[PDB]
Design a protein around this motif. Sequence first.
Motif, PDB file in Angstrom:
ATOM      1  N   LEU A  61      30.566 -52.139 -40.960  1.00  0.00           N
ATOM      2  CA  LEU A  61      30.355 -53.292 -40.129  1.00  0.00           C
ATOM      3  C   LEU A  61      29.085 -53.110 -39.335  1.00  0.00           C
ATOM      4  O   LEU A  61      29.116 -52.856 -38.170  1.00  0.00           O
ATOM      5  N   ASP A  62      27.969 -53.228 -40.025  1.00  0.00           N
ATOM      6  CA  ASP A  62      26.643 -53.132 -39.466  1.00  0.00           C
ATOM      7  C   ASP A  62      26.308 -54.557 -39.089  1.00  0.00           C
ATOM      8  O   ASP A  62      27.192 -55.387 -39.056  1.00  0.00           O
ATOM      9  N   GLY A  63      25.055 -54.848 -38.805  1.00  0.00           N
ATOM     10  CA  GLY A  63      24.712 -56.194 -38.428  1.00  0.00           C
ATOM     11  C   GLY A  63      24.859 -56.419 -36.950  1.00  0.00           C
ATOM     12  O   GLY A  63      24.903 -55.485 -36.181  1.00  0.00           O
ATOM     13  N   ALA A  64      24.919 -57.680 -36.574  1.00  0.00           N
ATOM     14  CA  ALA A  64      24.920 -58.087 -35.174  1.00  0.00           C
ATOM     15  C   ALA A  64      26.300 -58.002 -34.532  1.00  0.00           C
ATOM     16  O   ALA A  64      27.312 -58.326 -35.153  1.00  0.00           O
ATOM     17  N   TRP A  65      26.325 -57.588 -33.266  1.00  0.00           N
ATOM     18  CA  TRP A  65      27.535 -57.615 -32.461  1.00  0.00           C
ATOM     19  C   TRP A  65      27.270 -58.344 -31.155  1.00  0.00           C
ATOM     20  O   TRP A  65      26.190 -58.217 -30.575  1.00  0.00           O
ATOM     21  N   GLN A  66      28.270 -59.093 -30.697  1.00  0.00           N
ATOM     22  CA  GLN A  66      28.278 -59.602 -29.335  1.00  0.00           C
ATOM     23  C   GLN A  66      28.866 -58.534 -28.430  1.00  0.00           C
ATOM     24  O   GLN A  66      29.868 -57.896 -28.780  1.00  0.00           O
ATOM     25  N   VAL A  67      28.238 -58.327 -27.277  1.00  0.00           N
ATOM     26  CA  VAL A  67      28.732 -57.401 -26.271  1.00  0.00           C
ATOM     27  C   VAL A  67      28.842 -58.133 -24.945  1.00  0.00           C
ATOM     28  O   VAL A  67      27.857 -58.706 -24.473  1.00  0.00           O
ATOM     29  N   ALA A  68      30.024 -58.082 -24.330  1.00  0.00           N
ATOM     30  CA  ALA A  68      30.229 -58.650 -23.008  1.00  0.00           C
ATOM     31  C   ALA A  68      30.585 -57.525 -22.055  1.00  0.00           C
ATOM     32  O   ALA A  68      31.385 -56.654 -22.397  1.00  0.00           O
ATOM     33  N   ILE A  92      34.033 -51.363 -18.827  1.00  0.00           N
ATOM     34  CA  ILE A  92      34.541 -51.803 -20.124  1.00  0.00           C
ATOM     35  C   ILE A  92      33.539 -52.776 -20.728  1.00  0.00           C
ATOM     36  O   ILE A  92      33.288 -53.850 -20.168  1.00  0.00           O
ATOM     37  N   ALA A  93      32.957 -52.397 -21.860  1.00  0.00           N
ATOM     38  CA  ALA A  93      32.114 -53.291 -22.645  1.00  0.00           C
ATOM     39  C   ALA A  93      32.926 -53.810 -23.827  1.00  0.00           C
ATOM     40  O   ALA A  93      33.539 -53.022 -24.557  1.00  0.00           O
ATOM     41  N   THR A  94      32.933 -55.131 -24.011  1.00  0.00           N
ATOM     42  CA  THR A  94      33.742 -55.773 -25.045  1.00  0.00           C
ATOM     43  C   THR A  94      32.845 -56.183 -26.211  1.00  0.00           C
ATOM     44  O   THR A  94      32.001 -57.080 -26.076  1.00  0.00           O
ATOM     45  N   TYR A  95      33.023 -55.522 -27.350  1.00  0.00           N
ATOM     46  CA  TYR A  95      32.252 -55.819 -28.546  1.00  0.00           C
ATOM     47  C   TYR A  95      33.009 -56.805 -29.424  1.00  0.00           C
ATOM     48  O   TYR A  95      34.224 -56.690 -29.605  1.00  0.00           O
ATOM     49  N   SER A  96      32.268 -57.741 -30.006  1.00  0.00           N
ATOM     50  CA  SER A  96      32.812 -58.935 -30.642  1.00  0.00           C
ATOM     51  C   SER A  96      32.074 -59.168 -31.944  1.00  0.00           C
ATOM     52  O   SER A  96      30.850 -59.011 -31.999  1.00  0.00           O
ATOM     53  N   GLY A 107      40.235 -63.135 -45.974  1.00  0.00           N
ATOM     54  CA  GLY A 107      39.088 -63.903 -45.516  1.00  0.00           C
ATOM     55  C   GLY A 107      38.489 -63.410 -44.214  1.00  0.00           C
ATOM     56  O   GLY A 107      38.413 -62.203 -43.975  1.00  0.00           O
ATOM     57  N   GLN A 108      38.056 -64.332 -43.358  1.00  0.00           N
ATOM     58  CA  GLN A 108      37.407 -63.946 -42.118  1.00  0.00           C
ATOM     59  C   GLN A 108      38.429 -63.489 -41.087  1.00  0.00           C
ATOM     60  O   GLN A 108      39.476 -64.118 -40.905  1.00  0.00           O
ATOM     61  N   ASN A 109      38.107 -62.385 -40.412  1.00  0.00           N
ATOM     62  CA  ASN A 109      38.929 -61.786 -39.370  1.00  0.00           C
ATOM     63  C   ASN A 109      38.092 -61.630 -38.110  1.00  0.00           C
ATOM     64  O   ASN A 109      36.899 -61.319 -38.186  1.00  0.00           O
ATOM     65  N   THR A 110      38.715 -61.822 -36.948  1.00  0.00           N
ATOM     66  CA  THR A 110      38.030 -61.582 -35.692  1.00  0.00           C
ATOM     67  C   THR A 110      38.288 -60.143 -35.274  1.00  0.00           C
ATOM     68  O   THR A 110      39.357 -59.584 -35.541  1.00  0.00           O
ATOM     69  N   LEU A 111      37.286 -59.543 -34.645  1.00  0.00           N
ATOM     70  CA  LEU A 111      37.319 -58.151 -34.219  1.00  0.00           C
ATOM     71  C   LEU A 111      36.809 -58.106 -32.789  1.00  0.00           C
ATOM     72  O   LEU A 111      35.724 -58.621 -32.501  1.00  0.00           O
ATOM     73  N   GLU A 112      37.596 -57.511 -31.896  1.00  0.00           N
ATOM     74  CA  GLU A 112      37.190 -57.292 -30.512  1.00  0.00           C
ATOM     75  C   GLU A 112      37.518 -55.856 -30.153  1.00  0.00           C
ATOM     76  O   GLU A 112      38.635 -55.394 -30.399  1.00  0.00           O
ATOM     77  N   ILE A 113      36.541 -55.153 -29.591  1.00  0.00           N
ATOM     78  CA  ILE A 113      36.646 -53.729 -29.326  1.00  0.00           C
ATOM     79  C   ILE A 113      36.237 -53.511 -27.881  1.00  0.00           C
ATOM     80  O   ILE A 113      35.070 -53.714 -27.526  1.00  0.00           O
ATOM     81  N   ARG A 114      37.196 -53.115 -27.038  1.00  0.00           N
ATOM     82  CA  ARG A 114      36.928 -52.912 -25.627  1.00  0.00           C
ATOM     83  C   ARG A 114      36.665 -51.426 -25.431  1.00  0.00           C
ATOM     84  O   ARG A 114      37.583 -50.600 -25.571  1.00  0.00           O
TER      85      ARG A 114
END
Length: 1055
Positions: free
Chosen positions: A902-909, A942-946, A1000-1007
């Motif tokens: 899972l390379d590519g772009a990530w959202q981080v909050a 806590i950084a939340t990766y999306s 198919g498409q799955n959402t992934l969130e990593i805190r």
Amino acid sequence: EPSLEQAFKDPPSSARPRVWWHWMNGNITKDGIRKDLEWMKRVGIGGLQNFDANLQTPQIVDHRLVYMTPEWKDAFRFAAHEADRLDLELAIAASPGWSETGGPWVKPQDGLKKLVWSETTLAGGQRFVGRLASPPGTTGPFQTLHPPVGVSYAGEVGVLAFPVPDIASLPVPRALDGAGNVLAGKALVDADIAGGVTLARVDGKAPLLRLDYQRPVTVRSATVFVPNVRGAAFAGTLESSQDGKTWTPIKALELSNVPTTISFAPVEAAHFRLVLNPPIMVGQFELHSDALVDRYETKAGFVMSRDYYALVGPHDNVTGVDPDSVIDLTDKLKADGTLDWAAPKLPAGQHWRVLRLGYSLLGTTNHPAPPEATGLEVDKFDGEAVREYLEHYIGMYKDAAGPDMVGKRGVRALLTDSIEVGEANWTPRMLEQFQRLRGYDARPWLPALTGTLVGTREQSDRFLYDYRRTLADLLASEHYGTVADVAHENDLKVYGEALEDHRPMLGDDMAMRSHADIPMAALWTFNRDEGPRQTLIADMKGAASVAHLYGQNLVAAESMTASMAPWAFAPKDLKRFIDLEFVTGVNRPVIHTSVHVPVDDKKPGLSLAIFGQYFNRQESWAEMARPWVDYIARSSLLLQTGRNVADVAYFYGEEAPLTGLYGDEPVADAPVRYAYDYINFNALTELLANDGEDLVAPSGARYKTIYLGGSSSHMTLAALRKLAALVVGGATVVGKAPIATPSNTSAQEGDLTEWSSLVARLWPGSGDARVGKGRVIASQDIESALQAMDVAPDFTFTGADAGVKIPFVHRRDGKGEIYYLVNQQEAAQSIEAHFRVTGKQPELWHPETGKSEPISYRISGGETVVPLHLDGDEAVFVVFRKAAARDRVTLARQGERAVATLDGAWQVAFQADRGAPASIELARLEPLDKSADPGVKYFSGIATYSRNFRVTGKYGEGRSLWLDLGRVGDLAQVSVNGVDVGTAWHAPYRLDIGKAVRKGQNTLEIRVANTWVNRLIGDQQEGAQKITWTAMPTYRADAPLRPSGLIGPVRLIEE
Ligand code: NA
């Protein structure tokens, strides 16, 4: 009702770890107490142990709450009601502050006491005229000495008289410093042993004190005191100049807070030098014509020796005062100070010596409490005084919390912290206690406690051993027994630590904990390079042995104390510490510490001085600590289940405690492939009984053999009797014959001969003798003796490098076996593990997840062989409870296959109010600490990766899908399509997602949570807008950052 599998998934309260919960210097609010205890519930903590700690701490509350004032008491009452409401076990320490058992309600008469004395000479054929000089009444460690850089009490002990030979008095010498300065020699024999002469320093150091005489004098003993030797670095050597320039060393003098007396074969010289190998004042330096008790100060308990058998005396064949000559004149002393005695006539050349014994206070105090709550440590050898101390203390908490909140509700437990109260060696009932415990009258031998040789050197040395042993006996019964009794009378349990650190005072650290409900030890964090503090290994092993032998079962430890490492720990850093506690026998960690958080604004906020752990609701990863606590709770659950299994009872003798014997060097003597418990004299003589060829205790502890280790080459007749009786009753003993008794008991009771007969019976010469129905193997090779008894190894393994340690715990129930294994190495291992068990199909149980997993195995020849892969520092349970359908199972080999990265772009909050922007986009996973943006670089929280990701498989039904996170700083909680699949907090950071994914498409969130370290460093940078508050500074702007965030690579992996 719940099965072990269900309990392992969701551990009960009894399995959940406790925390220490320090109230820092009045920084206390009810608002914070509730948020603290609600955090502890969220995170799965089972209880907490409060301390009101009077350590200087900045005031961050509107007003400090002073110990035991109304507002303080209402706060504590609230804490007790919240713990009751929240089902948290609340404990308090046994004194204001944290140790030991002291406070201002201890009357002066009831404080710790030391023996003191005055001396007088008489003719014989004379009625004593005038007053016996009063013994010193100074509070302090010895005689007239004060405590180092006002309450007092002087008691009476008795008056003894005994004949003594007229001795050649010695001239006053010329006192020459190293340089050649003329000192006031008479001040070396001054009534003030702390006030003598100051020494000048000569080039090359070597400060010395030359005593030059005008004729040769015959010296047999010397006493030295150097004030303030406070680690406490100084040695000293006594030399004699026959010519004034040629020196032959006589003996060395270890120096301490109390004087040092040495005795030797006589020396004739006119020059004597005290050389101080590394304002130097020498308060006392006294040469004696007569022979004194060699090193009597330490033998009498005024200062500790590590090994009292190591104090080898001179071989001069002298004999001192005849014990039968000693007369008890206690009767004849009047309050006036006068002594009404007709001194009987003596042979010529022989005068009377009258010894007036008294006691006075040590002055030591509980710590760290405010002055109003600070006062004398209660006399630890006096059961009544201890009881009065503790009943009053418990009364204070019943008033504070309300009596409904002490006992069965609210405050459930008492903690006796590790003890360090100085060196006390008198208590008013001592003579009766000595008689009852040692079997003979101490009165004729008391002069040895003051330096006067009584009988042979060996007899006085054995009396002093017996005296030290009585003090150790009374500590265990009169302090710790009474503490447990009083707690129990009030429906409280006792967590009980002991010595912990080497040998701070007399006492046996198993006996000291044998009465407590929860024997307790400690373990500090340590660098992998350096290894743990050995004394803490012994401390824990002793505490675990107590719980196994006396049936407490629970073993607590003050866990993961850290020094000068501010907020520098995430669970990834702590796992190896708690695993070491687990594999040593701890099964109830008590985390040091969770300082009380009185206000929310200051982050990370208060700390217990320079110490960690920093495990409270302000910790950066605090809201993600539940999986870590679950790991501890799950491990503790299995490690409390059934009973410990050990094959060897390691008897360590009657001398130094376990933290003493093994305070520096670990036990080199113990089995590896078999588990063991230590047994002390009480366990040997009161618990162990024959069961066929085994030794069993009422707890169910069961051993194949006793091993004679530690200091057991010196053994008492009482111990030898019990050992012989167990042997003759069918037991096996492994060890070589003892060489002596350390005690006078058998000589005084007329049992001389019996000791030698018993040694001859158990050790007839063959080196492996059948003795009665039992067996004595005269070996110090425990595993080769177990082999000769046909006792198979409990746990062993092949396929690892040499030096690889995989220590183990073995638990046993009616339902089967549980083995706990820890790979104490960074390198992964692939082993074949051999367990002494049969008839069961093993399974691996993982405390990270609460899940069990099947494993391949072969049952054959009395053992089960299991192929195991262990990651670096992996800990795992190999559980043998399911009945084996087959004797061999080979599971289909499972391959790994990377499916995607899972390379590519990530959202981080980013967690708000942490100095970071609300969110960023990363074109590529990168360590946040390398970011160009300082708010990201220095982020703590806590950084939340999306991200989304595609799945083209069906999973669960025989094929699993793992998410491997790669490098993670420092832990990560993962949600897949909104479903929490767990949190990965140590390497390998891998989670099973097969059940949560969809086609198919799955959402992934990593805190991802990290430590406070980076934001602390970030706050030291020039121009920094400061996020954090701490009491003292933590890091320099130099400090290297810790890797932060989701570093990766993140991979999907199929089986
Ligand atoms: Na301690």
